[PDB]
Amino acid sequence: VSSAAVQWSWDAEFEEVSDDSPEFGQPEIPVKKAQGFVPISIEALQDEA
Amino acid sequence: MGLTKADGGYLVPFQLDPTVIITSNGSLNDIRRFARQVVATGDVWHG
Protein backbone atom coordinates (compact mmCIF):
# COMPACT_ATOMS: atom_id res chain seq x y z
CA VAL A 1 0.00 0.00 0.00
CA SER A 2 1.30 3.43 -0.97
CA SER A 3 -0.01 6.97 -0.51
CA ALA A 4 1.05 10.63 -0.65
CA ALA A 5 0.96 13.66 1.64
CA VAL A 6 -1.74 16.33 2.04
CA GLN A 7 -1.61 19.67 0.25
CA TRP A 8 -1.83 22.61 2.64
CA SER A 9 -2.67 26.21 1.74
CA TRP A 10 -2.31 29.70 3.18
CA ASP A 11 -5.92 30.81 3.63
CA ALA A 12 -7.44 34.09 4.79
CA GLU A 13 -10.01 34.82 7.49
CA PHE A 14 -13.50 33.39 6.99
CA GLU A 15 -12.34 31.46 3.92
CA GLU A 16 -13.26 27.85 3.20
CA VAL A 17 -10.69 25.08 3.26
CA SER A 18 -9.95 22.96 0.21
CA ASP A 19 -10.91 19.30 -0.10
CA ASP A 20 -7.65 17.36 0.27
CA SER A 21 -8.14 13.64 -0.21
CA PRO A 22 -4.90 11.68 -0.73
CA GLU A 23 -5.23 8.97 -3.37
CA PHE A 24 -3.81 5.52 -2.63
CA GLY A 25 -2.13 2.82 -4.68
CA GLN A 26 -1.41 -0.90 -4.54
CA PRO A 27 1.87 -2.19 -5.99
CA GLU A 28 1.89 -5.94 -6.66
CA ILE A 29 4.78 -8.32 -7.32
CA PRO A 30 3.99 -11.69 -8.97
CA VAL A 31 5.99 -14.84 -8.28
CA LYS A 32 7.34 -16.65 -11.34
CA LYS A 33 9.18 -19.91 -11.98
CA ALA A 34 12.32 -21.17 -13.73
CA GLN A 35 13.51 -24.70 -14.46
CA GLY A 36 16.09 -26.85 -16.22
CA PHE A 37 16.39 -30.48 -17.23
CA VAL A 38 19.23 -32.93 -17.96
CA PRO A 39 18.42 -36.36 -19.44
CA ILE A 40 20.94 -39.21 -19.27
CA SER A 41 21.28 -42.80 -20.46
CA ILE A 42 21.59 -45.89 -18.29
CA GLU A 43 24.94 -47.04 -19.55
CA ALA A 44 26.30 -43.54 -19.18
CA LEU A 45 24.88 -43.44 -15.69
CA GLN A 46 26.59 -46.71 -14.85
CA ASP A 47 29.99 -46.09 -16.48
CA GLU A 48 30.76 -42.40 -15.92
CA ALA A 49 32.16 -41.66 -12.47
CA MET B 1 24.45 -37.24 -21.33
CA GLY B 2 25.66 -40.23 -23.34
CA LEU B 3 28.58 -42.51 -24.15
CA THR B 4 29.88 -40.24 -26.91
CA LYS B 5 33.10 -38.64 -25.72
CA ALA B 6 31.79 -35.10 -26.27
CA ASP B 7 28.57 -35.71 -24.28
CA GLY B 8 29.90 -37.08 -21.02
CA GLY B 9 32.21 -39.86 -22.16
CA TYR B 10 35.33 -38.16 -20.81
CA LEU B 11 34.32 -39.21 -17.29
CA VAL B 12 34.51 -42.92 -18.18
CA PRO B 13 37.74 -44.37 -16.72
CA PHE B 14 39.99 -46.49 -18.90
CA GLN B 15 40.08 -50.24 -18.22
CA LEU B 16 43.14 -52.39 -18.87
CA ASP B 17 43.79 -56.02 -17.96
CA PRO B 18 47.51 -56.64 -17.28
CA THR B 19 47.57 -60.37 -18.18
CA VAL B 20 49.57 -60.84 -21.38
CA ILE B 21 48.15 -63.29 -23.93
CA ILE B 22 50.96 -65.17 -25.64
CA THR B 23 50.44 -65.40 -29.39
CA SER B 24 53.60 -67.24 -30.47
CA ASN B 25 53.32 -70.64 -32.12
CA GLY B 26 55.93 -72.07 -29.77
CA SER B 27 56.96 -75.71 -29.67
CA LEU B 28 55.74 -78.66 -27.60
CA ASN B 29 57.81 -81.60 -26.37
CA ASP B 30 57.34 -84.41 -23.84
CA ILE B 31 60.85 -85.85 -23.49
CA ARG B 32 61.28 -84.39 -19.99
CA ARG B 33 58.43 -86.66 -18.87
CA PHE B 34 60.21 -89.91 -19.86
CA ALA B 35 63.87 -89.04 -19.36
CA ARG B 36 66.13 -89.36 -16.33
CA GLN B 37 66.97 -85.97 -14.80
CA VAL B 38 70.22 -85.96 -12.80
CA VAL B 39 71.74 -82.93 -11.04
CA ALA B 40 75.32 -81.80 -11.68
CA THR B 41 77.79 -79.76 -9.63
CA GLY B 42 80.70 -78.81 -11.90
CA ASP B 43 81.00 -78.74 -15.69
CA VAL B 44 80.95 -82.44 -16.68
CA TRP B 45 78.81 -85.28 -15.32
CA HIS B 46 80.38 -88.75 -15.12
CA GLY B 47 78.62 -92.07 -14.58
Cβ contacts from A onto B, under 8 A? 25
State the amino acid at position B41 in one-letter form: T
Nearest residue to A1 (alpha-carbon basis) of A15, A22, A31: A22
What is residue A42's DSSP assignment? H
Model resolution, angstroms: 3.4
Answer yes or no: do B1 and A40 touch at CB < 8 A.
yes
Do residues A18 and A7 make contact, with C-beta atoms less than 8 angstroms apart?
A: yes
Q: Which residue of chain B is at minimal alpha-carbon distance from A40?
A: B1
Whether residue B1 contacts residue A39, with contact meaning beta carbons closer than 8 Å, is answered with yes
State how far the Cα of B28 lies from the Cα of A17, in Å rounded to an integer.
127
User: In chain A, what residues touch B12 (CB-CB under 8 Å)?
Assistant: 47-49
SS3 annotation, B16-33: CCCCCCCCCCCCCCCHHH
Sorted by sequence, the CB contacts under 8 Å of residue A48 that are 6+ apart come out as: B1, B8, B9, B11, B12
In whole angstroms, give the CA distance from residue A7 to residue A19. 9
d(CA B47, CA B38): 11
Q: Are A17 and A35 in contact (CB under 8 A)?
A: no
C-alpha distances out from residue A31 to A3, A25, A35, A37, Å? 24, 20, 14, 21
d(CA B18, CA A34): 50
Residues A47 and B12: their CA atoms lie apart, in Å, by 6
